[PDB]
Design a binder for this molecule. Structure first.
Ligand SMILES: [Mg+2]
Lengths: 95, 499, 499, 193, 122
């Protein structure tokens, strides 16, 4: 079989305060057979406690402080094949 | 109390799949929500499941300005003046000739043994304008899938297995069908709202809690007080009924600056989750599109959206589509973009205040009343009610008549005609054919039953009418190039009735 | 289109309660959810409310591999070859003798005046294997309770008040009953899912919002765009129907390491709250046990769980039980352990993003379709529909036929026979009796109506079949000690139909 | 206690042997076990002697999971919507046209006077899948041989000698046959040895 | 996918005439139905020639053929207690469905299906 392809709707999130919650969609990820696992991971970002690291298709980020973020989405095949793709998020402080 | 529509059109049927049945799937890679597995067949089928394949715009106006209801009674379907043409290309030229010996096969699935695909709003009916010639659509269907793969209960249907009728030039096909007893569609709006059914002159004999605390020196004190509601506190009246069910939709504006600058076409959509995959609810349960004086807002996926003439297939701008709106039912059904209401969440007491919550989803409750979605001139007529153990109020969500035994699928295909065979036997499957296609006339005649309007109201009603001013083109007409267009969606609720 | 089952068994009826009616309650101390109040009676009753009391395993296979539906039509019940035995113990020895003068009393509650207890999945039916002899169960019932105490509306029924039939050796009892018109059970799975009923070859004429913002220089800009859905965006298609209702259950794994290390059998259970007390919902509304390829998961209390032969009563390990699974209905019903879908929660605008929420509870909505729970060979046949003003879709949640007037309770008891009375009158209640019990044959004959399978599918279907390989024991047979066992639960959905 | 199967297919019949009857043999050299002598004819024949030319797989399953036996009772055979095409090649191109005047000859050998070749598991029946179009097989037969040579009792059959039916476009052919009493096939295994 | 019948050879003696490949041995099997295109001569010379005509107009025929067979059945009537063996499709997922056409329109029969699933005693 062919390995899955990870897809993220927004790749340049531009959300500033007071808006503290954005969202990244990974439900568009596609592969010949079906995807059996979704895995989100924050590669970098503002040192804080509220982390997600969840296993859902659509990622919901809340309580986001200002700074730069980078999330890596990893999807898994029914055979075990995987693929990853990165997402960018920027949270600016009010003006 | 009866109106008979009759429509004749000219169709062209090519040979599909080169006569083969093929397995089709999303096995090229898709999202979990987009995976499928099914079969494309070599057959074509006849689709006349839209009101405009039967009613001319003037007929529609006559129907909606004068009737409170209508429903289909019977239909007669015909195929005649059939002719098969053989196409041969030599030296980069095309020659077409008539074959009086070739046939066309017609299978009418009156026992509903094949997957019913009419009822899924597909594009391929008899054109609304009678002078248009149309291509008959290819029949295909889907079965169970697990990703892009099939499972054991997945079904494969071969249509030749069933007995069909053969037609050669000169032969004609007739089919008569009777619709089952179905409720009349309600072609009227209500002149009263559910929360205004009382007599505004007389107070109620019943009481309601009108105050909870009262002045006690310098501060308040807990004290329950009751009042009888009259016209001044009309919101507090005791009532016997509740607004219909709801499944909240997101709200978008026809004014691009009123909307958020992000991608929420999917992330903010109202969905249903079935066997691991999400589907958009569209259009969901019948709800009002907007509340009074907010005509610019509509439910993200809560209304039927038609395309204007010549509109493309993807990422078309809002000026290319005609967004319908169901503001007529706002008298009984909740507004699609707001909460159904509010409900208590805790138990109040001396040191705890009453808390409440919005209810964004509301299943049917005893005492609920509602109106179903409206039908349009360019919308669906019927849908087959799924064959299940239970189906609550089986009125197709896109609008129309839910039928147990809908008009059967009428499938048609060109009989294959082998090209020159070798002179030595070969067990191999025949793969060379004489190129051809058929064409002919099709006429559908439906008898509709009507409920004549009989209003005793004094002032004049609302009627659908053409705009009396001057214009470059007339609505529902052909332009200077011969192109027919439908300028707007025409609903069915002009007349009024009280609740 | 008919199949008649007939079952004969040998029963033994002891004297219960020593002929007394006793008040029973939880008055020894219990939780609020476990309190009760009722009466144990001296009567026994006949229970044949399981499919295996009528169908042999082979009969069941014949039924499920060939029919799309079936429902009960009539029944004939008999008691014969009755014999009463008197037991006398002298010098630590037991002597049993026949009494041709003693009787047995049989009361058939055809007017439903007594609390109906059949329909609560109790263990005491005619054994599935015809050579087993069974003890007739004791009849008891519950009434209203307030803690461990009764209230004024609490009812007390004395069965002698009603006219019964007396039977001595040689007398026999016959009873015929006709079932009311009830829907056929659906013994088939669907070969199509609700979200895949479209023709995958043709696009829809309707549009849906496909994009909300678009590139504008270096950033995006709000802009609504629409598309017509075809096969590549099949999740966005406009549909006419919705999946059935849901009441979310927790998910547990048959693999102990996949589960949390805590006690949530109750704290994490799906419950209903009635008059101050909680009850487990089990099995609740018909839902699919798991989504594709997750056969190891099941609803905490969403499926019927049978015990393997010789399984104990409490805290039995998972290898001792047979967990059923309703994956067949996943084509129309939601998966029991996931959300019904998602719904909009706010109103988006320039400075506010669209927000959504999962719906873990969903009452019926117009346009919803669903399949009821499957019946099993070792499961319930019918249940009495509660006598209430309203009851939506009265299909017993454990599975089976909901009946207004179910087969009546047939109660039986040994007539008391006083031991040697004193020779001087005493008004005191007689408390010394001659020890005895009765025994006899019971035969139940049910006529079932069938809907023969008539599939026009081309490829072969799924059929229930025994495993063709070699084995130490044959399934649904007796072992080397004479013990009969049912190795697995056998459902009824093998054949397939389309939606 | 009855099940009726029905199968319709589209066939193509070329002209065989260029209309000639030819003597055929292994006279080009063969082993003693492979020698033969016979005739290839210009005729084609219809073969529906396989269960899949009548039973769909689902039908077969319905039959085998529910019956202890079955046997054929009667059959009805039809030929219809016949059309003859004439092929003319000019300047390296192919043109096909319809001839409503030409015929097709159909001979049903109900008196079993010709060598019966059905029953030798040959490949040319109505395809199992109903949408397949098949070429009608050429009829040929063998007679007595002594090596690659014939002997005096070797028979030669000319099919035109028999009376056949002529069919032009529009004409159809029907034939009904009743099977003789034959034992039921045993569709069951024994549970005892 | 096997043979239905065979013609029993016309001989003086034939012990238990059940075709060895399987099926129904028949004395008078369904008759051979032979068919052929009538020859149509091409342009003949204008002077008589006794020689055999060897030039023909190239052609072929085509049409529909339908066979309808009525079969008699002996319904299974087992009084056995445990369940029998039945022919069944494999309930698991697969790229292609058995006895179906593939992505190119090619029909295939994946395995041979016999007729002996049900059981009787000896
Ligand atoms: Mg893959």
């Amino acid at each position: 079989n062919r390995p899955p392809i990870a897809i993220v709707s927004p790749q340049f999130q531009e959300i500033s305060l007071p808006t503290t919650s954005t969202v990244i969609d990974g439900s568009q990820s596609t592969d010949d057979d079906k995807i059996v696992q979704y895995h989100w991971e924050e590669l970098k970002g503002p040192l804080r406690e509220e982390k997600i690291s969840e296993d859902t298709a659509i990622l919901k980020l809340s309580k986001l402080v200002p700074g730069n973020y980078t999330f890596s989405l990893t999807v898994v095949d029914s055979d075990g094949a995987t693929n990853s793709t990165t997402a960018n998020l920027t949270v600016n402080k009010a003006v | 109390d009866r109106v008979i529509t009759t429509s004749t059109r000219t169709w062209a049927l090519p040979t599909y799949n080169n006569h083969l049945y093929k397995q089709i799937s999303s096995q090229s890679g898709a999202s979990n929500d987009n995976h499928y597995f099914g079969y494309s067949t070599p057959w074509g089928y006849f689709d006349f499941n839209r009101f405009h394949c039967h009613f001319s715009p003037r007929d529609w106006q006559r129907l909606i300005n004068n009737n409170w209801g209508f429903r289909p009674k019977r239909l007669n379907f015909k195929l005649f003046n059939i002719q098969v043409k053989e196409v041969t290309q030599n030296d980069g030229t095309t020659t077409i000739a008539n074959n009086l010996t070739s046939t066309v096969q017609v299978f009418t699935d009156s026992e509903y043994q094949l997957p019913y695909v009419l009822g899924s709003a597909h594009q391929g009916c008899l054109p609304p304008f009678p002078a248009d010639v149309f291509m008959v659509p290819q029949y295909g269907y889907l079965t169970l899938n697990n990703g892009s793969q099939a499972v054991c209960r997945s079904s494969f249907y071969c249509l030749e297995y069933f007995p069909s009728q053969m037609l050669r030039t000169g032969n004609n096909f007739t089919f008569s069908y009777t619709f089952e007893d179905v409720p009349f569609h309600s072609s009227y709006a209500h002149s009263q709202s559910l929360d205004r059914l009382m007599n505004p002159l007389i107070d109620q004999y019943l009481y309601y809690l009108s105050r909870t605390n009262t002045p006690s020196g310098t501060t308040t004190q807990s004290r329950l007080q009751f009042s009888q509601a009259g016209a001044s506190d009309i919101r507090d009246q005791s009532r016997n009924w509740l607004p219909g069910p709801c499944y909240r939709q997101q709200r978008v504006s026809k004014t691009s600056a009123d909307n958020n600058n992000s991608e929420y076409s999917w992330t903010g959509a109202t969905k249903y989750h079935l066997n691991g995959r999400d589907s958009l609810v569209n259009p969901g349960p019948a709800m009002a599109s907007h509340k009074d004086d907010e005509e610019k807002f509509f439910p993200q996926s809560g209304v039927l959206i038609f395309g204007k003439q010549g509109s493309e297939k993807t990422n078309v701008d809002i000026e290319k589509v005609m967004i319908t709106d169901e503001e007529e039912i706002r008298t009984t059904n909740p507004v699609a973009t707001e909460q159904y209401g509010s409900v208590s969440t805790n138990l109040q007491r001396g040191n705890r205040q009453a808390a409440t919550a919005d209810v964004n989803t509301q299943g049917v409750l005893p005492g609920m009343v509602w109106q179903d979605r409206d039908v349009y001139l360019q919308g669906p007529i019927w849908a087959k009610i799924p064959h299940t153990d239970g189906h609550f109020h089986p009125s197709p969500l896109m609008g129309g008549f839910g039928l147990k035994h809908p008009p059967p699928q009428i499938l048609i295909k060109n009989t294959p005609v082998p090209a020159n065979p070798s002179t030595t036997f070969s067990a191999a499957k025949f793969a060379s054919f004489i190129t051809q296609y058929s064409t002919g006339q099709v006429s559908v005649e439906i008898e509709w039953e009507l409920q004549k309007e009989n209003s005793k109201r004094w002032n004049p009603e609302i009627q659908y009418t053409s705009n009396y001013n001057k214009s470059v083109n007339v609505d529902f007409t052909v332009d200077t190039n011969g192109v027919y267009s439908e300028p707007r969606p025409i609903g069915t609720r002009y007349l009024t009735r009280n609740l």
